[PDB]
Structures are given as C-alpha cells and as structure tokens.
Amino acid sequence: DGLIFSPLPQNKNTVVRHYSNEQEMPNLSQMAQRTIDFPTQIVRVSGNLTGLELSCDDVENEIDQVFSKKISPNLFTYNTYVSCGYDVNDPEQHATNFSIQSYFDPLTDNAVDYLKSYLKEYNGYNLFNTTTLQIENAKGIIVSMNLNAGLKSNPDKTPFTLYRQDRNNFYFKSNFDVRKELISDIYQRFYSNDPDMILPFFDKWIFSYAGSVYYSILMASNYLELQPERIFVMENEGDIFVSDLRYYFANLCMKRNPNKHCL
C-alpha cells in the first residue's frame, strides 16, 4: 500500500531503465523556495540506431552524460524511462533503436537557474547523429483522477469488491503544482481515519458533497485507490503526452486502522 508504480511495458530484446523520485513525498519547505511558475519539462525522443555499431552500454552512457546525471534528485522531481533495443541475431548484438520518455520539474529558484543554463547548453543536443534531445515545455496538465472504494478479503492479492467509483478533473500549470497541492493533500488527508480530514478531502477533490455520500461507504470499505492520470497538454493543438510511467495510491484501511475499515 501507499504509492505503487504501474508495471513497465517490457519489450522482447530491449534494455529498459526507470529512474524516478516521484515516490518521495513532496517537501513543502523545499517547494516554497520556488517563487515563480516554470513549466514541466517533457522529453519524448526516439531514434533508429541500426548501422552505427553502438552497444546498449554506449547508448546508456551517452544518455547519462547529456541528460540523466545533469538532473539531480536534490533539485528536480523526475520520472524517466530509457530503452535500447538490440539485434539478438547480430554477432555483436549492436543497439538498433532507443527512446527517452521523461517529465521533470525544478523544485526551487536555484533549480530553475540551473535548469535555464542546462537548457541553453543541451537543448537540441545531437544524439548519435540520428535525433536531437528536444526538451519541451508542457503548457499545463489535466489530472483525471479516479477514486475506487471497496472491500478486499486478501490484502496480498489484486481482486476486491468495488462498492463505488468516481472521477474528477483539474487543470494545473505544472506537475510541480500537482505535487504541491494535490499529492501533498493525499499524504496529509487521504491516509487518515479522522472523518474531519478524509471527508473534507473528498469534498475538495471528488465532488462538493462527496463527504456526505462516502461516510457510510468508508465505514463499509477496507480498501481505497486514487489513480491521478497526468495528461500533459503540449503547445500545439491536439498534442497530449501521457507517460507510460504511471503511479496510483493504494490505501489498505484493513491494516492501518484499529477497526479494519476506512472509517
């Protein structure tokens, strides 16, 4: 229970690397040291490497030198997937293709200064003379958040009795603002059996009188989930980005509360 990452799509003959600190609770003290809006940075880059005679270790090294190692978990929240396909039948098993999927946010004014300088030097960097490292500004994010409430009889397994499902939708300027407002509130109030914490959390995020509807449902339930789907809105009309890098909040009331229910 808590923040669970969704399984990686694991292709046939492909090295896959996942780097994230999105699992770490938002640090409101740190984030208060950012005094301006800055867009979430997006990387959705891919390239054919057939014929360049690169190994997967060469591809991973170049991406680490120009991207991964420049984005520190002390200055940024990031979620990054790096993949490198190789030719199983080639006597050298040379890399045939690669991709970088990332979103990341500077957490402070000093991180924003460091970022502006990283972008000036590295935005547009020639990767393997095949494609460029394009770091894009998301215009904003729409969170389409699902709530599940129900009764699970075995906490080690996936199946449960679903009692109620709700969706609500919010626009934020960045993933930074998602973490500062919604994610911090999940940690503070969604994981509470104090009715004056969780019922008002529901009034704010689910629907304005969800607190009244859910009192009886929470008393009958032992298991909640929140799935905040992050839909990044890009600058061009009709361009959305959703990272394969997904997380959800599981709340095992059965184990957290003395009475083994959500209320």
Residue numbers in the entry: 7 to 269
Q: From the publication, what sentences describe this entry?
A:
L. pneumophila also expresses a type II secretion system (T2SS). The Legionella T2SS exports at least 25 proteins. In summary, using a combined cellular, structural, biophysical and biochemical approach we have provided a characterization of three novel type II secreted substrates, NttA, NttC and NttE, that are required for infection of several species of amoeba. We also report the X-ray crystal structures of NttE and NttC, the solution nuclear magnetic resonance (NMR) structure of NttA and dynamic analyses for each substrate using complementary biophysical techniques.
Previous proteomic analysis of culture supernatants from wild-type L. pneumophila 130b strain (a clinical isolate) and a T2SS (lspF) mutant identified NttE, a 288-amino acid protein encoded by the lpw02811 ORF (lpg0189 in strain Philadelphia-1; lpp0250 in strain Paris; lpl0249 in strain Lens), as a secreted substrate of the L. pneumophila T2SS. Crystals of NttE were obtained at pH 6.5 and the structure was determined using selenium single-wavelength anomalous dispersion (Se-SAD) phasing with electron density maps refined to 2.2 Å. The final model contains two molecules in the asymmetric unit and all residues could be built except for the N-terminal His6 tags and the NttE residues Asn1 to Ala6. Each NttE protomer is formed of two domains, with the N-terminal domain (residues T20 to N143) composed of 7 α-helices and 3 β-strands, and the C-terminal domain (residues D7 to F11 and G146 to L269) formed from 5 α-helices and 4 β-strands. Two disulfide bonds are present in each chain of NttE, one in the N-terminal domain between Cys62 and Cys90, and another in the C-terminal domain between Cys259 and Cys268. The NttE dimer is mainly stabilized through β-sheet interactions provided by the C-terminal domain and the presence of this dimer in the asymmetric unit strongly indicates that NttE is a dimer in solution. The NttE α1 helix mediates hydrophobic interactions with the α4 helix in the C-terminal domain, and it appears that small changes in this interface results in large changes in the orientation of the N-terminal region. However, analysis of all known sequences of NttE homologs from Legionella species and A. siphonis revealed a conservation hotspot at the interface of the N- and C-terminal domains, positioned on the “top” face of the NttE dimer. Comparison of the two models with lowest χ2 values with the crystal structure of NttE-130b highlighted significant variability in the positioning of the N-terminal domains, although in all models the β1 strand remained tethered to the C-terminal domain. Together these data indicate that the N-terminal domains of NttE are mobile and this may be important for its function in modifying the bacterial cell surface and/or during intracellular infection.
